[PDB]
Amino acid sequence: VNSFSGYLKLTDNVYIKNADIVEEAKKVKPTVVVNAANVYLKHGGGVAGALNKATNNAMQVESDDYIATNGPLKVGGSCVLSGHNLAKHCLHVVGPNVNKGEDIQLLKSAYENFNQHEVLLAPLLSAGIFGADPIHSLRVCVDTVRTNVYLAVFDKNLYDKLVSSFL
């Protein structure tokens, strides 16, 4: 039993809600919140910009030190950093950005990072400004993640379409 509330159950381990991931994180304070990161951990917009703003830019400061030490992530890769005021940890995961020409096949590799964590609050990878089809992202999530994932979908119209079309 956990403290996530109001989710629709899609499968044994995947749940979905119409919610702002920032507000969800502030309420639940989960062990792991997933960021929709880019390889440079430049949290300018989308989910990343919103999560960073909620940390008063502390996420960006920590991320800049991480990159200065380690260099960029790989597309499909991840790193674990602090969750600041939002969660214990933030798992920064880089899905392919279709608006950059990146291979959508890397979406499965990105979701594999979730399997290293028993429970996560997450957005749909490569959705929104990363330009992939969110219906496709949900399918890859369900077919790849085996740990317990609570998906927050900001857009109510999109949430309803994802539910209604789910196979």
Ligand X SMILES: OC1(CNc2ncnc3[nH]ccc23)CCSCC1
- Whose Cβ is closer to Cl ion: residue 30's or residue 46's? 46
Name the one range near ligand X by CB under 6 A: 67-75, 80-88, 139-147, 152-160.
152-160
Phi, psi of 28 (to 5 degrees): -80, -35
Shortest-Cβ-distance residue relative to ligand X: 127
Q: Is 46 in the site for ligand X (CB under 6 A)?
A: yes
Q: Is 73 in the site for ligand X (CB under 6 A)?
A: no
Q: Which of residues 108-137 bind Cl ion (CB under 5 A)?
A: 128-129
Q: Is 76 in the site for Cl ion (CB under 5 A)?
A: no
Work out which of 8, 13, 20, 119 binds ligand X, going by CB under 6 A: 20
- Whose Cβ is closer to ligand X: residue 70's or residue 106's? 106
Q: Is 152 in the site for ligand X (CB under 6 A)?
A: yes
Give the Cα-Cα-Cα angle 131, 6, 17 (nearest 5 degrees): 5
Name the one range near ligand X by CB under 6 A: 58-66, 94-102, 113-121, 153-161.
153-161
DSSP secondary structure, 19-56, as one string = --HHHHHHHH--SEEEEE--TT----SHHHHHHHHHTT
Is residue 72 classed as helix, strand or coil in its secondary structure? coil
d(CA 23, CA 85): 11
Strands 148-153 and 8-9, sheet pairing: unpaired
- Whose Cβ is closer to ligand X: residue 48's or residue 73's? 48
Cβ proximity of 124 and 137 under 8 Å: yes
